[PDB]
Amino acid sequence: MKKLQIAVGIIRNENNEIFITRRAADAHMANKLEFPGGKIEMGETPEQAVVRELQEEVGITPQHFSLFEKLEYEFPDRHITLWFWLVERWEGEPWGKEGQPGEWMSLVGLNADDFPPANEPVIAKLKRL
Ligand SMILES: Nc1nc2c([nH]c(=O)n2[C@H]2C[C@H](O)[C@@H](COP(=O)(O)O)O2)c(=O)[nH]1
Ligand SMILES: OC[C@H]1O[C@@](CO)(O[C@H]2O[C@H](CO)[C@@H](O)[C@H](O)[C@H]2O)[C@@H](O)[C@@H]1O
Ligand SMILES: [Mn+2]
Ligand code: NA
């Protein structure tokens, strides 16, 4: 079974909205809503990975961010460790830089069923803010 370290950014604006993208139909966790992010590469740290991933996926540079949650989840065919970074300050304006759908979503309106099941406790904890 594949093992992966994944860094993702919870991008929260001043209006308690989160920038959420939707995964491609032919990807793992196809069509799911997601926090932008991706695999931590060899030779880079989790903090460096979330910066690089958000630059690649949505065109922002996170700064002064914090680790909101770290958890592990066993999917049917892979084991992933997810690093959820809370990103409240950044340079740039997030957009669908890789052609993917992206939009701002109110925190209170998030439905954990729309996300990969690994995100369940994080979406709950975000609504506790
Ligand atoms: N990018 C991202 N990936 C997630 C989230 N939740 C989650 O289980 N994953 C999983 C889906 C993929 O198996 C893997 C990410 O790899 P890619 O983003 O490179 O597809 O992590 C999330 O919120 N954002
Ligand atoms: O791990 C994040 C954690 O560390 C602090 C300092 O105690 O922030 C530092 O690390 C962040 C991630 O690299 C940087 O963005 C930040 O600039 C740096 O001070 C905490 O703020 C944070 O909770
Ligand atoms: Mn990704
Ligand atoms: Na990516």
Annotate 70-127 with DSSP letters as a single string.
EEEEE-SSEEEEEEEEEE-EEES----TTS--EEEEEGGG--GGGS-GGGHHHHHHHH
* Rounded (to 5) percent helix, strand, coil in the chain: 25, 40, 35
The amino acid present at 82, given as its one-letter code, is: L
Count of CB atoms situated within 10 Å of the CB of 82: 20
Q: Of 35, 38, 20, 23, nearest to 102 (Cα)?
A: 20
- The domain tally of the chain equals 1
Nearest of 15, 104, 9, 6 to residue 55 by alpha carbon: 9
- Label residues 30-58 b or e (16+ Cβ within 10 Å = b): eebbbbbbbebeeeeebeebbbbbbbebb
CA distance 46 to 58: 18
Q: Whose CA is nearest to atom 18 of ligand 2?
A: 64
Residue 70 and residue 82 in contact, taking contact as beta carbons nearer than 8 Å: yes
Separation of alpha carbons 15 and 17, rounded Å? 5
Look up the domain containing 36 and give its range.
1-129
Beta bridge partners of 1: none
Closest residue by CA, ligand 1 atom 16: 38
23 marked as part of a ligand binding site: yes
Q: Which method was it determined by?
A: X-ray
Token pair listed for 68 = 């909101």
Quick one: which ligand is closest to 84's CA?
Answer: 1
Answer whether 38 contacts ligand 1 (Cβ < 6 A).
yes
- Name residues contacting ligand 2 (CB within 6 A): 47, 63-67
Tokens of 114: 């729309």
- What's the residue count for the chain? 129
- Give the bridge partners for 20, in sequence order: 103
